[PDB]
Structure 1
Amino acid sequence: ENGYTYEDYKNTAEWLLSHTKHRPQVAIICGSGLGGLTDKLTQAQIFDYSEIPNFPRSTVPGHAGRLVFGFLNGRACVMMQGRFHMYEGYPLWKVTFPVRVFHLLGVDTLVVTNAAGGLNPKFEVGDIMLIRDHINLPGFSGQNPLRGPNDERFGDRFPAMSDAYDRTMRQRALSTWKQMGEQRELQEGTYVMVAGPSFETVAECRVLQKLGADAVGMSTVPEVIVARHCGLRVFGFSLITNKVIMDYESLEKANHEEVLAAGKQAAQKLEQFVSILMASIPLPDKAS
């Protein structure tokens, strides 16, 4: 985990402990425009990234740069509003530092969210996709958050990712959606991480499509991965904010204004979802 040491994590976890009365169980990292979830907490105790000991700040635009503590629909969460991306300069051991601290803080579940582009045509903007799998492109080329000496206090050298996106939690998600009897089904498919801040070209989109991806994005994977390394339960969704183009002869392209998505009903649609889903995450009590 180059950069930080165990004790850096300990010292930050502890600092958090002795500065909040909350002992979170589920850590939620909100993607673009889905940070409204913070609103729904209770007994909320906000923490500015910067105020915490070794916490990677979030540049100057880190307006939504805070770690909120509270209770949501039954569980004592800890939310990350506004995360770190590879594309902004953060080496991956800064991007994923939270996940290690959430672990030592006591977390045992991580529900990671993000807005992503739509590659699967069956997807339509506004859609919500269940990450059943991911393709760690940067990781293939060495951009893996576990590069460097491994700490057997955190996990194994070679953790398997075959499993990562918890199966049961996916049943429960498919099901909770149906319970809400929602208009439009809870999409499910493979999520592909691509770093670059620029948006995919039509030649790029096509390789991802053949590659098996369904939604493309620029984060999540580093947090998914290091969480699993820790032994955290993991599941997540993607807010399809825009359909990804294809050559032939187009007329559109892709813009961030499409973030209107991340804020429109869609946003707060996933928020209700994520809220109700708190009721389907097992307690540490090993419930019986």
Structure 2
Amino acid sequence: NGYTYEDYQDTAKWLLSHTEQRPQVAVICGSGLGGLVNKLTQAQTFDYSEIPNFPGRLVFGILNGRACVMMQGRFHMYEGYPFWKVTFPVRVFRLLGVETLVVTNAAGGLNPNFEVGDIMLIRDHINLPGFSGENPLRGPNEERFGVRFPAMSDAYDRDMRQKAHSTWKQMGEQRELQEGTYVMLGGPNFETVAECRLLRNLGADAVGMSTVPEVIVARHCGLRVFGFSLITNKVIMDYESQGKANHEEVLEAGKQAAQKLEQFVSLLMASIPV
């Protein structure tokens, strides 16, 4: 990790001086949710380029009455960021006073029961880069954030998932809310058929390229975490299919679901403990 403890403190102190807002919730907007900052009131925006130590914009504002800090644009391993840069904002959030992190992403559906446009609550994850030691916590532990060996078995808050199921029901959507396991791999290529079959056999329901390292750092520093995937495509599972994953369809799925995603997150603000 290239950052010192004091880097995170300096960045938090800088933000705290430059805004009077004091959010308890941070939201990292993945695909389909880039427009969520447009639902904020009393919005104050900082370009990442103007914030000390930041590797896009960070927006402080109020979402459905709740003070939030939002990343419009996140960082990815596939773009060449190390995980200690990808996750820098999460520790800054903790030092700002945030207590809950909401994460979202786009993902391919491995579970054959999913459909394009589904929302999948993340109940759990599989961190494939972590199996080989690629991990934002690699290196000396900063005890001022958390412990050397943090547990991940309770990462995705149970109460929030129950409340998300309730909220969804009250929104009266025809399509049910999905829930399952998100597997992170590095990307940026999409998977072969053989890779898709094995990922599904690992127990995964959705595959993507982000989120997990953010969650690990969030849990290490004691944040409550809730997340979901937008299912943008059903991954190709056989050789006979003329289907082929492509950015175009992912972008189009994101566009079609944007309103539903934003609405759902906005409504969920009410369920986050104060």
Superposition TM-score, scaled by structure 1 size: 0.94
**Pairwise CA distance, 1:225:** 0.7
1:152-163 matched pairs, under 5 angstroms? 152-163=143-154
**Identity rate, percent:** 87
Which residue of structure 1 lines up, in the alignment, with residue 237 of structure 2? 246
Q: Which residue of 1 aligns with 2:16?
A: 17
| Rounded Cα–Cα distance in structure 1 between residues aligned with 2:34 and 2:69 | 12
Q: Determine whether 1:263 maps to 2:262.
A: no
Comparing 236-245 and 30-39, the one that deviates more: 30-39
What whole-Å deviation, never above 9, does each CA across 1:110-149 have from its counterpart, x for those lacking one? Answer: 0000000011010000000000000000000111111000
Matched, 1:168 2:133: no
Separation in 1 of the partners of 2:138 and 2:255? Answer: 35
SS in 2 for 1:54: coil
Looking at structure 2, the residues matched to 254 and 97 of structure 1 have their Cα atoms a distance apart, in angstroms, of: 31
What is the Cα deviation at residue 103 of structure 1?
Answer: 0.6
Shift >4 Å, 4+ stretches:
none
Rounded to whole Å, the distance in 1 between the matches of 2:140 and 2:71 is 27
SS of match in other structure, 1:69: strand
Q: What runs of 5+ residues in structure 2 fail to find an aligned partner?
A: none
TM-score for the superposition, normalised by structure 2: 0.98
- The answer to whether the Cα contact below 8 Å between 2:122 and 2:181 also exists between their aligned partners in 1 is yes
1:79 Cα deviation after fit: 0.3
Q: Secondary structure at the match of 1:77?
A: strand
**2:59 aligned to 48, 56, 68, which one?**
68
Counterparts of 1:1-288 in structure 2, within 5 Å, are 2-56=1-55, 65-258=56-249, 259-264=251-256, 266-283=257-274
Are the counterparts in 2 of residues 34 and 263 from structure 1 also a CA contact under 8 Å? no
Gaps of 5+ in 1: 57-64, 284-288
Cα root mean square deviation, aligned: 0.7
- The size of the alignment, in residue pairs, is 273
Conservation of the 8 A alpha-carbon contact between 1:110 and 1:233: yes
Amino acid at match of 1:33: G
CA distance in 2, matches of 1:70, 1:17: 14
